[PDB]
Design a protein around this ligand. Structure first.
Ligand SMILES: Nc1nc2c(ncn2[C@@H]2O[C@H](COP(=O)(O)OP(=O)(O)O)[C@@H](O)[C@H]2O)c(=O)[nH]1
Ligand SMILES: *C(=O)[C@@H](N)Cc1ccccc1
Lengths: 85, 82, 61, 205, 366
RNA sequence: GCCCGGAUAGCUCAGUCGGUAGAGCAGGGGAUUGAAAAUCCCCGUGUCCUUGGUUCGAUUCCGAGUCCGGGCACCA
RNA sequence: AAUUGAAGAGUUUGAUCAUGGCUCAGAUUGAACGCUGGCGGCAGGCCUAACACAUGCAAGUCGAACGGUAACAGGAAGAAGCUUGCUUCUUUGCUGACGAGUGGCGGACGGGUGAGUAAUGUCUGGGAAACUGCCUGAUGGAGGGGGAUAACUACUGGAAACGGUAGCUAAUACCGCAUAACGUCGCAAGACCAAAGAGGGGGACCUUCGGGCCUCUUGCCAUCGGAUGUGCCCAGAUGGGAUUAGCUAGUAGGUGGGGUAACGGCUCACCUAGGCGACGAUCCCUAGCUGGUCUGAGAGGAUGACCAGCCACACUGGAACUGAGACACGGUCCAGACUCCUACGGGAGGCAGCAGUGGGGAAUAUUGCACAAUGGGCGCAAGCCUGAUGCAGCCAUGCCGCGUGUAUGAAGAAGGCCUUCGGGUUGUAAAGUACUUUCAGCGGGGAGGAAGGGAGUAAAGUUAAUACCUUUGCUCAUUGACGUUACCCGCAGAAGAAGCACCGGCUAACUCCGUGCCAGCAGCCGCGGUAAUACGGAGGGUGCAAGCGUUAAUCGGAAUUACUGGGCGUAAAGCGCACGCAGGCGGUUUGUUAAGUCAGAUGUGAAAUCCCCGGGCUCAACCUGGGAACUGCAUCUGAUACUGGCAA
């Protein structure tokens, strides 16, 4: 529609594909610890968890994730790795 | 957001102004928390015509309320000191 | 069906009109009156009384 | 809003004088009073109970020169008062300014004073009021505009007032064309020949 | 819509009259082509503004013919060289005079088809004598030759003769008087249900002036109501002030399509009232001149043509004259079937069945 | 504004390819009666919408206008 | 001071009293029709098609964020006329400012509609498993680098829309690093996570001569708060039909994982067999809810336009991204219908935003003016945008004010009408006569709505500083759509201004002529059959008034749904009779609980409206201050009669 406020539409799409690149990267690491926890390797899982720790909290700090999701993904996952340990 | 702005009620050509404490994202005659006094620029040269519960105004000031230009000038005109 | 109240009218086969309610108590089955002075319903001629009814204009001179 | 027609006819219907056409003549007698309002006046009205209600209602209305819309509102403005409606109703009827100047004598008759008021000739508390239905407050003073003072009409009016009531609920000087109004009219001090009891009962159905 | 019109040049409304296949539609495009270097087209000159009227030259379309005659200050008589004095061309001189055209430009067309000056001068003479029989100084009318088709294709020789046409258009045809101080009057000719603006009525301003935001009222055979001139467009060109003589459009104050039709009259508030009874002075024409072949009678109902209309009315002949033969010079009372503003001195035409039988002139209103 | 159909006594229609307008349903006018139904005695109230023409001659032939219903436009 | 409040009559029958329907007298309305029509103030003005939509407008803004400057206006260098600085004129981002672009913010508010929705909604009252940009309070940090890209260029596809290829550059845009706390995770140890710089001015000092440096203002990053907004949860209330009686299988619940800001069948896997239901589930039809408005003595009944709170929707259906906030009116993507452009491959659009047009309909209006005021967004600010709002046009649609003149006036006429032709009546009515002038029309005066803002200047804090910044005064010019204003004065002449229903009873007010159960009247009983108080006309009279009637519509009269406040032998109405579950109700004594109830208190019951007392528009309507009420719900502390629970 003819409005100079259509600038938000193009700013949305450039911010769209960018957020997909960040979130898919964020969710990729979460799947990584799941594979490690399923092999019974409590050390590798502890290792992989240490990898995504500075990642998910680097995402909540910028304003992307609402920090409670970041907390929970770590929280239960914290109790998950020591459940095997 | 919160603010201590006015709210123009009254008849046509004979305006009235009611200083009200409300969320700034609401209409002029919209919802509000409370009205704190009023203002009549077309009343008369009688005994009254303007009342502002200065204390409640200042109570919201510490809370974070923004006083609008019209009433801020009106506050100093009603003599806070005198 | 509707009653056409008045002394002399010109409604024939079509002449779209206006209908105001009200029973008449004479003809069985009719509860409507045709408004005089609307769409095609002309005013009743020779009227000097009750012209608010029958759609009659006030005498000129 | 007014009758502005054969105004003396209304006094013939009720069979009583209402001071509607007083003028310079004290007693009329040339109106054929108490005999014929209209053409079939020789007949006799039956006066049903509802009929005596309506005739009593109008009696006071022709004198106070008001109409039903304003009359019924005066009743409602009388209905929301304490005590008694009837006595308070005659207070609001006499509350009109045109009644006061008539009681003052500035205006010769009822309708005449209305014209006097509506022609910006009367002033009260320094404010000229054109509204005839001005509710007069107790303890105040009315006056006449300087430019519209004594134009031969008010002169004839005051001399007529010497042969009337000149109520006690107001004080007139008649020397400086300035009169003051005291407290509201009392029931024991007014006409009393008229009835307001039925007017209260008529509007209760 | 846009583009406000500049009121700098005088607006003289002219039009073409004649017969079928003389070069009518061809010349309409020819005028606007060279100057740039019923349907209407316009053309503007650096000295004045001229409106052009193209009317159909067929007998059955007399309804469109008379409506086109209402905007004729200077008739452009286009006569083909291969045809000459045609009956309707003769009738256009007749009915043109019945509405009152003062000056007429005679244009000899299709001169490219016949190179013979002898007969072209003779066809000119035939038109000259045709004007003389209808009280027109045919010997004082500037004769201009020309070719319609070739001038439109770009033949500069025939195109330059269009300048001679425009030359006589500025000399033989002067700017008429505009009674602007007199009460505004306007012949309603066409109605346009403009999508988005409502109902638009068009016409040529007879008297007074007009301007956007002016209260107007419509008088005529239909009961008179109130309206408002809310928009003055002239071929999609807005105008702030239209004076008398202007061929503009007036936007109404929201009326429906089927109320205000061809026949009424837009006028200035409370100025001109309608009339139901009047007497006229007539000049009954002959069968060869255009009238009937049999004398009509009392009660006979022909149509009356004034300014736009073809309104029917009963002819009230004076008692005694029951047989009015073709060629009579009498006066009779006229009872119209519908009330309409009748001014004494109004020149009109008495027609019926597709022919003009009499030349009406309103004598007195009864 | 253009293209068609009905415009036939109160009502529905016939009659027509030039020859002095019909029928049915009506209804109405009289005697009997307080007033009628019922019975009987008599029965058409019409500018074939209007105006005009080709005329010894037009309901019907050809033209127009106006009224109603049915289809198309046009877009200062 | 704050509810001082309630009418009936006509009609069944030969007549009466009953029962019982029917109808009218009242009030009101988002009104419509007919007739009439002078002015003004305040409101209302698409209820039907949530029908389709031409065109303009309805949300943009910031250079004190950045690269740039395509244009406009200057400076400077230069250059040509030529009066040698009077002009002409080519460069130049060096300034004021500024199209297009990057970025931040707004666009989720404001505005409109009521289609959908019978409980996922709303209202009342409690509640905890949450979040919250802008604003404000407290303590801190703000150290150091890198990599692209739009605009701009070269070229190029396409009718346009709209792109494509290869290069150029900056930042509060982006991505690391450093550094971490009462922040997050964890039993703990420990582990882990942030960012941005600009603007004004200036002494010393310093100038790779951009600037560093000092200071003031502004903005940014982290955490706990507050306030506001928002999401969510339980209980109760919130339509009709039982000719709808069984219904549900993520359905009821548990453990574990996942998912959301948050609890949760919100969603999955396994397991169990439950959950809802006559104090109404599912099903069917209708409908936005509430504060309120109208009616009514109240209780209730109807209803939910305008103002306000809330929810839902945005051509239709659907999904999701962005973002603090939407799963979105002037945003996107996909399918479909309807329009539209087309160079026929392919694209564009959504008035239930102001107006406006067609169409529907009995019916509802201008394609107006200004951002002066209030409110909102951006900005330090000045300002900019603002169809919100403020006003105007139009309309008797409603309420309220007012005028169409006042006084005098008897041949007590003319004309009209009735008549016992005597006369009466029209009728002090008019005329004649004497005065005044509202509102209209004309011409001049003239408020207030205006608070502030810009420049200049003084004092005091700020600072190294008389500078800059900021706070408070003083001064100049002022910022007004309405607007030919409200109001005031002057001028002229009664000069410009009254109709409508009815007139037999209900229900105020009559005769005459004419038509003869014909024409017509009507709300009901009914009038009219050749003397009509009821038809039509004439006069007179009556009700009301710029309104008067009619019709639709709700309530009232209707105690004809009766809780307040009705009935059941014969008038409509006792199941043919009985047993009996759930349910309703219960003798008498004490104790006890304090549930209901009762007393007082608390929070709350939004505002407005309504009731009272005052104030301000010439008065009124209207606007409006304080108060009361909001007849209610929840909690706490007491009372123990009556009711209910347990025990004897
Ligand atoms: N050759 C030729 N033909 C002509 C000329 N002028 C007009 N015409 C013809 O006239 C014809 C139609 O002319 P027009 O006036 O438009 O007729 P209308 O509009 O139907 O009455 C066209 O076919 C032209 O060929 C001319 O100058 N030369
Ligand atoms: C509209 O353009 C009118 N001014 C002229 C016109 C043109 C064509 C048809 C009718 C009127």
């Amino acid at each position: 529609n003819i409005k100079s406020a259509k600038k938000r539409a193009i700013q949305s799409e450039k911010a769209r594909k960018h957020n997909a690149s960040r979130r898919s990267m964020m969710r990729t690491f979460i799947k990584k610890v799941y594979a490690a926890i399923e092999a019974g390797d409590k050390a590798a899982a502890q290792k992989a968890f240490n990898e995504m720790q500075p990642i998910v909290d680097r995402q909540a700090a910028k304003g992307l994730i609402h920090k409670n999701k970041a907390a929970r993904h770590k929280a239960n996952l914290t109790a998950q790795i020591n459940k095997l340990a | 957001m919160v603010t201590i702005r006015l709210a123009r009620h009254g008849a046509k050509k004979r305006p009235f102004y009611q200083v009200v404490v409300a969320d700034s994202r609401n209409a002029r005659n919209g919802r509000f928390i409370e009205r704190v006094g009023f203002f009549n620029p077309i009343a008369s040269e009688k005994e009254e015509g303007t009342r502002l519960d200065l204390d409640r105004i200042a109570h919201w000031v510490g809370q974070g309320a923004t006083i609008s230009d019209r009433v801020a000038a009106l506050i100093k005109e009603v003599n806070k000191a005198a | 069906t509707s009653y056409i109240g008045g002394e002399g009218h010109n409604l024939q086969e079509h002449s779209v009109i206006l209908i105001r309610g009200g029973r008449v108590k004479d003809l069985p089955g009719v509860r409507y009156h045709t408004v005089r002075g609307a769409l095609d319903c002309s005013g009743v001629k020779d009227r000097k009384q009750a012209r608010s009814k029958y759609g009659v204009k006030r005498p000129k001179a | 809003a007014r009758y502005l027609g054969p105004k003396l006819k209304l006094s013939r219907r009720e069979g009583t004088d209402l001071f509607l056409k007083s003028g310079v003549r004290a007693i009329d007698t040339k109106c054929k009073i108490e005999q014929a309002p209209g053409q079939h006046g020789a007949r006799k009205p039956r006066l049903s109970d509802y009929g005596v209600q309506l005739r009593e209602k109008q009696k006071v209305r022709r004198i106070y020169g008001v109409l039903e819309r304003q009359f019924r509102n005066y009743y409602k403005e009388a209905a929301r008062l304490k005590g008694n409606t009837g006595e308070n109703l005659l207070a609001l009827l006499e509350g009109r300014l045109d009644n006061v100047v008539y009681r003052m004598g500035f205006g010769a008759t009822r309708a005449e004073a209305r014209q006097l008021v509506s022609h910006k000739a009367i002033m009260v508390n320094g404010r000229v009021v054109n509204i005839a239905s001005y509710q007069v407050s107790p303890n105040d003073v009315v006056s006449i505009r300087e430019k519209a003072k004594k134009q031969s009409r008010v002169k004839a009016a005051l001399e007529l007032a010497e042969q009337r009531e000149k109520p006690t609920w107001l004080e007139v000087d008649a020397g400086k064309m300035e009169g003051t109004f005291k407290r509201k009219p009392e029931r024991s001090d007014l006409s009393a020949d008229i009835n307001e009891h039925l007017i209260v009962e008529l509007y209760s159905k | 819509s846009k583009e406000k019109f500049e009121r700098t040049k005088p607006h003289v409304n002219v039009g073409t009259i004649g017969h079928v296949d003389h070069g009518k539609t061809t010349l309409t495009a020819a005028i606007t082509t060279v100057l740039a270097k019923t349907s209407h087209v316009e053309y503007d000159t650096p000295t004045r503004h001229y409106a052009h009227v193209d009317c159909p030259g067929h007998a059955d379309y007399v309804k469109n013919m008379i409506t086109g005659a209402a905007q004729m200050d200077g008739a452009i008589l286009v006569v083909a060289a291969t045809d000459g004095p045609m009956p309707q061309t003769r009738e256009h001189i007749l009915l043109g005079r019945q509405v009152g055209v003062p000056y007429i430009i005679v244009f000899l067309n299709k001169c490219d088809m016949v190179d013979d000056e002898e007969l072209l001068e003779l066809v000119e003479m035939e038109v000259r004598e045709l004007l003389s029989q209808y009280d027109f100084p045919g010997d004082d009318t500037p004769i201009v030759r020309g070719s319609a088709l070739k001038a439109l294709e770009g033949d500069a020789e025939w195109e330059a003769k269009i300048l001679e046409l425009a030359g006589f258009l500025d000399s033989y045809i002067p700017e008429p008087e505009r009674a602007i101080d007199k009460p505004f009057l306007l012949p309603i000719e066409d109605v346009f249900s403009i999508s988005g603006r409502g109902t638009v009525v068009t016409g040529r301003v007879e008297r007074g002036i007009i301007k956007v935001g002016e209260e107007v009222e419509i008088v005529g055979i239909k009961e008179t109501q109130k309206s408002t001139c809310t928009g003055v467009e002239m071929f999609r060109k807005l105008l702030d002030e239209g004076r008398a003589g202007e061929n503009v459009g007036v936007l109404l104050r929201g009326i429906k399509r089927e109320e205000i039709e061809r026949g009424q009259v837009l006028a200035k508030p409370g100025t001109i009232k309608p009339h139901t009874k009047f007497e006229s002075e007539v000049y009954i024409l002959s069968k060869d001149e255009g009238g009937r072949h049999t004398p009509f009678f009392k009660g006979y109902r022909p149509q009356f043509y004034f300014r736009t209309t073809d309104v029917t009315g009963t002819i009230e002949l004076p008692e005694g004259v029951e047989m009015v033969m073709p060629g009579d010079n009498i006066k009779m009372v006229v009872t119209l079937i519908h009330p309409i503003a009748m001014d004494d001195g109004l020149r009109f035409a008495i027609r019926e069945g597709g022919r003009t039988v009499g030349a009406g002139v309103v004598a007195k209103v009864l």
